[PDB]
Amino acid sequence: VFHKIRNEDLIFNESLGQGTFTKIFKGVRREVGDYGQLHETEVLLKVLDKAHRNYSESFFEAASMMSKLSHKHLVLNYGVCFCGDENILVQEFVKFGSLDTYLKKNKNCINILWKLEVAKQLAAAMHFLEENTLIHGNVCAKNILLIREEDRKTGNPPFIKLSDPGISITVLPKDILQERIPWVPPECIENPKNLNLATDKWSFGTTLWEICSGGDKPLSALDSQRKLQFYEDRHQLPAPKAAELANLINNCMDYEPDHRPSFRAIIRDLNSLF
Ligand SMILES: O=c1cc(-c2ccccc2)nc2c(-c3ccccc3)c(C(F)(F)F)[nH]n12
């Protein structure tokens, strides 16, 4: 069950972008906080499209399943608004936003050690999810959010959190899944019901490719039919320019799901690049 937040206590401000069948807004929540102090808290508001109310169950289940776990690398859910007839999630506002946009804007000021640290953090989150046998199912750089920048003065590294997967690929139209190649693994293009913990290992590889490519999108030049051929011919992504993690990427993006390494093994390999 989700906490109910009064429409009166929520103000919607700027549009930040779109998810699958969703609109994303920054907003403010008036709330009673610690010691009874009133706060006006920045929040991230996800609104399900009114034309896609058919997906409301999966929209809310995506956030609900992750809200029953607590972890430093997982975005906090605050509740739902209900907001009349609207379907709205209220979650933590992460100051610097999506990692994919951040990587692009700061491509020249981000070295391999920065990318390694963020990769280790993501793998930590995914290992926590694996230990809890919780499938995410939509790991990608768009869904990783940067809480804090590197601060060389105090030696603080960047710090990320993983947001919820949104509507599940087990219910999305096939065309959307094909557009999501190569984050959606080949067995899920074959059948979305093959969604498995092994799915997230494959998607983690694709996300690491994003992190190493300064925010490029793999296979973006390929339309959906060519993305299908990419899997039919069993291709692998090119090594990123920052090729230090190329081997780890391809080992995660194993066409055999049962052979993808555990996130424990992934974390050990990330720690071994030294
Ligand atoms: O907390 C935030 C904070 C910001 C954000 C956006 C712009 C500037 C600073 C922060 N942007 C997002 C998004 C987002 C927004 C548009 C497209 C993809 C992701 C998510 C979501 F949860 F949706 F992943 N949270 N978030």
CA of 143 relative to ligand 1 center, distance in Å: 8
Nearest ligand 1 atom to the CA of 93 is 1
Would you call 119 helix, strand, or coil by DSSP? helix
The domain locations on the chain are 1-93, 94-274
Sign of CA dihedral 195, 198, 204, 209: negative
CA of 255 relative to ligand 1 center, distance in Å: 31
Would you call 174 helix, strand, or coil by DSSP? helix
CA of 62 relative to ligand 1 center, distance in Å: 16
CA of 260 relative to ligand 1 center, distance in Å: 30
CA of 151 relative to ligand 1 center, distance in Å: 21
66 Cβ inside 6 Å of ligand 1: no
Half-sphere exposure of 162 (CA within 13 A, CB side): 32
Structure tokens at 206: 């694709």
- Picking from 203, 193, 120, 128, the residue whose alpha carbon sits closest to that of residue 165 is 203
Q: Residue 68 burial by CB count (10 A; 0-12/13-18/19+): exposed, middle or buried?
A: exposed
Q: Resolution (in Å) of the shown entry?
A: 1.5
Structure tokens at 41: 């808290």
CA gyration radius, the chain: 19
24 Cβ inside 6 Å of ligand 1: yes
Q: Are 204 and 122 spatial neighbours (Cβ–Cβ below 8 Å)? A: yes
CA of 200 relative to ligand 1 center, distance in Å: 21
Structure tokens at 214: 């300064």
DSSP secondary structure, 66-115, as one string: HHTS--TTBPPEEEE---TT--EEEEEPPTT-BHHHHHHHTGGG--HHHH
Q: Residue 41 burial by CB count (10 A; 0-12/13-18/19+): exposed, middle or buried?
A: middle
Q: Residue 223 burial by CB count (10 A; 0-12/13-18/19+): exposed, middle or buried?
A: exposed
**Residue 233: CB atoms within 10 Å:** 7
Using CA positions, which residue lies closest to atom 8 of ligand 1?
A: 97
Structure tokens at 15: 């549009």
Q: Where are the alpha helices (DSSP H) in 140-222?
A: 174-179, 186-190, 197-212
Beta bridge partners of 23: 18, 47
Using CA positions, which residue lies closest to atom 3 of ligand 1?
A: 97
Structure tokens at 72: 């430093």
Using CA positions, which residue lies closest to atom 26 of ligand 1?
A: 97
Would you call 270 helix, strand, or coil by DSSP? helix
Beta bridge partners of 89: 46, 80
As a dihedral over the C-alpha atoms of residue 44, residue 180, residue 165, residue 108, rounded to 10 degrees, the angle is -50
Q: Extract the runs of DSSP E, i.e. beta strands, from 67-132.
A: 77-80, 88-92
